Amino acid sequence: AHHHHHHSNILGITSKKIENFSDWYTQVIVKSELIEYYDGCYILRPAAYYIWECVQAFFNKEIKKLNVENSYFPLFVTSETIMYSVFPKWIRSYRDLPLKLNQWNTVVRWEFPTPFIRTREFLWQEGHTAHKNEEEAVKLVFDILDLYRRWYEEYLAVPIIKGIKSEGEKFGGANFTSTAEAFISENGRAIQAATSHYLGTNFAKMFKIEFEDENEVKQYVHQTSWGCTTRSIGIMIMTHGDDKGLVLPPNVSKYKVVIVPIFYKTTDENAIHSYCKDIEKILKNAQINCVYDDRASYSPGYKFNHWELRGIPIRIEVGPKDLQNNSCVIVRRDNNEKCNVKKESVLLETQQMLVDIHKNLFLKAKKKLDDSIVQVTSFSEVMNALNKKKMVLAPWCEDIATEEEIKKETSGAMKPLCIPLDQPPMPPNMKCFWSGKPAKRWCLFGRSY
Amino acid sequence: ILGITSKKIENFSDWYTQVIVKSELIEYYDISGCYILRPAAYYIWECVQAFFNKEIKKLNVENSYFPLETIMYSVFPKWIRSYRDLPLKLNQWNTVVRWEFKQPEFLWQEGHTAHKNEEEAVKLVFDILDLYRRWYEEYLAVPIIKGIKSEGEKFGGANFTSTAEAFISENGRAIQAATSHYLGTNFAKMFKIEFEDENEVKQYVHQTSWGCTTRSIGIMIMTHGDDKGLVLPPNVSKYKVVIVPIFDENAIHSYCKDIEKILKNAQINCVYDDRASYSPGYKFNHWELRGIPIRIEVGPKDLQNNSCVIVRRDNNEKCNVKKESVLLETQQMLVDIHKNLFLKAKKKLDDSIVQVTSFSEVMNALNKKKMVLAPWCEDIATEEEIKKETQRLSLGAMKPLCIPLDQPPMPPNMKCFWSGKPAKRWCLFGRSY
Numbered sequence: 113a114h115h116h117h118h119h120s121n122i123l124g125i126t127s128k129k130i131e132n133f134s135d136w137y138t139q140v141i142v143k144s145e146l147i148e149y150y151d152g153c154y155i156l157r158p159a160a161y162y163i164w165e166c167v168q169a170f171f172n173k174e175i176k177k178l179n180v181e182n183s184y185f186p187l188f189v190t191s192e193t194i195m196y197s198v199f200p201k202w203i204r205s206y207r208d209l210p211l212k213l214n215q216w217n218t219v220v221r222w223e224f225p226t227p228f229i230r231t232r233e234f235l236w237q238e239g240h241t242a243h244k245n246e247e248e249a250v251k252l253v254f255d256i257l258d259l260y261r262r263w264y265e266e267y268l269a270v271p272i273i274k275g276i277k278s279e280g281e282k283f284g285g286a287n288f289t290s291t292a293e294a295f296i297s298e299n300g301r302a303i304q305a306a307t308s309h310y311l312g313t314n315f316a317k318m319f320k321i322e323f324e325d326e327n328e329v330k331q332y333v334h335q336t337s338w339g340c341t342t343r344s345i346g347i348m349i350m351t352h353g354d355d356k357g358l359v360l361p362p363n364v365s366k367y368k369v370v371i372v373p374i375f376y377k378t379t380d381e382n383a384i385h386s387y388c389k390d391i392e393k394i395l396k397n398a399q400i401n402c403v404y405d406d407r408a409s410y411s412p413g414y415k416f417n418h419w420e421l422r423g424i425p426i427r428i429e430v431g432p433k434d435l436q437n438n439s440c441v442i443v444r445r446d447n448n449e450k451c452n453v454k455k456e457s458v459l460l461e462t463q464q465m466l467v468d469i470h471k472n473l474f475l476k477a478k479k480k481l482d483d484s485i486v487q488v489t490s491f492s493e494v495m496n497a498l499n500k501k502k503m504v505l506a507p508w509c510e511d512i513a514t515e516e517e518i519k520k521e522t523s524g525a526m527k528p529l530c531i532p533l534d535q536p537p538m539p540p541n542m543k544c545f546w547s548g549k550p551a552k553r554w555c556l557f558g559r560s561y
Numbered sequence: 562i563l564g565i566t567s568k569k570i571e572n573f574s575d576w577y578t579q580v581i582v583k584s585e586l587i588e589y590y591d592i593s594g595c596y597i598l599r600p601a602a603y604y605i606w607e608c609v610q611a612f613f614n615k616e617i618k619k620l621n622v623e624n625s626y627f628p629l630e631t632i633m634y635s636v637f638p639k640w641i642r643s644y645r646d647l648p649l650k651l652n653q654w655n656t657v658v659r660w661e662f663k664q665p666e667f668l669w670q671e672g673h674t675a676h677k678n679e680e681e682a683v684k685l686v687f688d689i690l691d692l693y694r695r696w697y698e699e700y701l702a703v704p705i706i707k708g709i710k711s712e713g714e715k716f717g718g719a720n721f722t723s724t725a726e727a728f729i730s731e732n733g734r735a736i737q738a739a740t741s742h743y744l745g746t747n748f749a750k751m752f753k754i755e756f757e758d759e760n761e762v763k764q765y766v767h768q769t770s771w772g773c774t775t776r777s778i779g780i781m782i783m784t785h786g787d788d789k790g791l792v793l794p795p796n797v798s799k800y801k802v803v804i805v806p807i808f809d810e811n812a813i814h815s816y817c818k819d820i821e822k823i824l825k826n827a828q829i830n831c832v833y834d835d836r837a838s839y840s841p842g843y844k845f846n847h848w849e850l851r852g853i854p855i856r857i858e859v860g861p862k863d864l865q866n867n868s869c870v871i872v873r874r875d876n877n878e879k880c881n882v883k884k885e886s887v888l889l890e891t892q893q894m895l896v897d898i899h900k901n902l903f904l905k906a907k908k909k910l911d912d913s914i915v916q917v918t919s920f921s922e923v924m925n926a927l928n929k930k931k932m933v934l935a936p937w938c939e940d941i942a943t944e945e946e947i948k949k950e951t952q953r954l955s956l957g958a959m960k961p962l963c964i965p966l967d968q969p970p971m972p973p974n975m976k977c978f979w980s981g982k983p984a985k986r987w988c989l990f991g992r993s994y
């Protein structure tokens with residue numbers, strides 16, 4: 113009957129994030145128990161699906177405050193839902209507006225493949241609304257965009273940049289496409305995090321989606337659509353993961369704490385086991401889910417690595433030194449800092465530490481994001497920035513023809529990510545870094561996914 | 562308005578189509594019969610999903626997503642090596658996608674578990690089955706009968722299939738409402754799902770599976786719907802109350818808005834139908850069709866007496882209520898509506914079961930749109946014999962629905978109604994969907 117003292121190198125992460133990012137990622141997603149391959153479609157195991165559940169609960173609650181109703185439309189065409197053609201059957205009068213719908217979807221197809229990120233398999237939501245006028249639709253587009261900011265920032269501890277897509281990168285049926293953009297600094301790649309579209313009257317004209325207004329004048333509806341996918345999980349993994357494995361923001365971890373007993377003598381086993389159970393009770397009585405790993409066949413050291421790999425935010429260790437001192441050792445996953453905590457203070461310190469882990473994960477990620485943006489004047493400064501795994505903020509004329517030319521001259525190509533909502537001042541005579549006719553606004557450009 | 566034009570008792574299938582479309586539950590895409598679950602239908606699914614998730618989580622079942630039982634079980638040995646890995650408990654909420662220009666219920670739930678022994682597995686099978694009873698009975702106000710399927714009607718891979726059966730008395734047809742299967746070690750042997758037990762002995766896992774679909778919604782509609790349209794148990798209606806003004810014209814609005822705020826402040830969602838271009842009669846029918854549990858009517862006299870009139874959807878009874886008593890009376894009424902819907906459906910279910918001792922009583926019961934509870938020897942070969950004979954006499958077949966968990970006494974000398982060797986247990990038989 114075998115005792116396992118040492119977690120073998122091969123069962124941990126054998127590639128370093130910075131040195132071999134793609135293999136590092138592959139290893140983390142399987143070894144942390146997020147996903148499992150069947151044969152390259154993958155199963156979302158509970159640790160991944162739990163993250164989706166948490167963001168789904170938050171988003172549902174928030175969209176319901178905006179009177180959005182969930183629904184389910186099963187017919188799709190190549191991916192988009194057959195829906196707008198039905199809207200004339202439901203809308204006659206301003207009293208029928210706004211129409212506000214959302215659905216939670218699941219799709220799998222043959223892969224073409226980085227799980228969560230470049231995949232034909234995902235869970236998502238998409239919302240669709242129709243309003244009596246432009247201002248109400250555009251307000252809603254930006255309200256939803258801020259909810260995406262919160263999904264990322266409050267749940268995944270991922271900072272995003274809000275912006276408007278360039279004409280070449282926006283959805284063809286949209287008047288404008290707003291976006292949340294994320295950036296993975298370790299490989300220099302931007303990735304679109306969520307989208308929120310003002311569709312104007314385009315589909316109303318196609319399907320005769322018209323209503324009688326309050327003045328008895330016929331008008332087109334103004335539409336919106338918006339979506340966010342399990343790509344969000346990938347972004348989170350890539351943002352916080354380290355060389356020991358997965359790191360989970362506490363808000364999307366099922367177990368907040370793992371309790372590990374330390375003892376080598378049978379005379380100590382009962383007191384250790386009992387104290388560990390006291391701590392498990394204290395936390396669970398307080399609605400803090402946790403796991404007490406009391407397996408006899410694995411050493412404490414093995415268990416440390418086992419649960420770090422799984423991304424548990426806090427580990428509490430209990431050894432004989434701790435019984436003697438009425439304490440325990442609390443270890444944070446994010447930065448591996450340890451402290452001794454009195455038994456009576458474990459609840460409060462754990463609560464405070466879960467909040468601080470989230471803050472630290474976010475603030476460190478935001479620093480990396482901010483440090484990844486180089487503001488440039490000229491195309492000659494661009495390649496050095498790209499090669500430093502950066503994206504660039506450049507004054508740009510926003511001429512659609514230039515997007516394919518920028519791509520072509522700089523997969524190694526950089527593309528317009530978004531024109532950020534937050535604009536630095538534009539100096540009086542600033543020229544486009546490409547054109548160079550007068551520059552309109554600053555645009556972010558980068559290599560992408 | 563065009564309301565419901567066919568009577569439930571007279572043309573059931575036409576009634577049903579009119580109710581599901583007119584009430585805004587579904588919209589058909591086209592003659593394929595593919596359809597949209599509109600918010601009124603999806604809201605029901607949401608409510609039961611919330612309930613079920615909460616309860617299965619108390620049993621440590623975790624949600625997951627396997628792309629679409631062979632993918633699934635072939636992967637289980639990768640996760641199970643010792644007793645420490647058990648029990649494995651998974652659930653999935655599934656959605657179907659139909660691609661328009663590609664070669665080919667839209668929502669359902671399926672769970673799967675694996676356990677160290679028979680006792681633990683079977684206990685979960687029955688715990689889940691009671692959660693399905695509660696899904697039906699607490700949220701949908703639909704009574705069900707728990708039982709075990711016959712050998713001929715169980716899932717072929719199961720050691721036994723437990724079931725919740727419902728009956729629609731207006732058309733005399735039973736319907737399987739949910740199922741929960743003990744799979745034994747059948748698939749474990751097939752996919753080599755073994756573990757090392759506490760004593761270092763290799764054992765097979767004991768598995769269960771269980772599911773329920775949007776058919777549950779259809780069952781609810783068939784059960785409580787009436788000739789005016791949909792009837793919603795309050796727990797699965799987005800709006801609990803509609804407020805309808807009856808023409809003041811300024812004081813009326815203000816008064817209706819006061820009631821709206823009282824209810825909404827107490828977290829009771831409601832709608833104040835203040836549309837100027839429709840009559841109150843129009844509005845009454847509009848909201849009845851849509852299944853809203855309670856209407857509150859406010860007219861001039863009610864202003865004068867500081868009252869209003871509360872009207873129940875289920876029985877159309879009215880009562881006069883003081884303004885300051887509206888919140889409490891509304892809360893009590895929503896409870897009482899659910900209780901009445903359930904009790905009247907339970908009475909119809911009870912009255913649909915004829916207990917028989919011989920085959921010569923069966924066709925009379927079937928032709929009266931009943932089910933029969935009969936003493937049966939349970940021999941699989943009799944199932945098709947009984948199907949054929951009841952079909953023949955109809956000119957339709959009845960089949961075994963379930964062997965109820967709640968068994969009446971079996972006299973020591975009772976014969977099977979068909980065979981009649983010694984009878985074992987009572988079995989429910991009926992026509993089915």
Ligand SMILES: [Cl-]
Nearest residue numbers: 189190660662
């Ligand atoms: Cl297609």
Ligand SMILES: [Cl-]
Nearest residue numbers: 362363368466
């Ligand atoms: Cl937390």
Ligand SMILES: [Cl-]
Nearest residue numbers: 714715716722
């Ligand atoms: Cl079955």
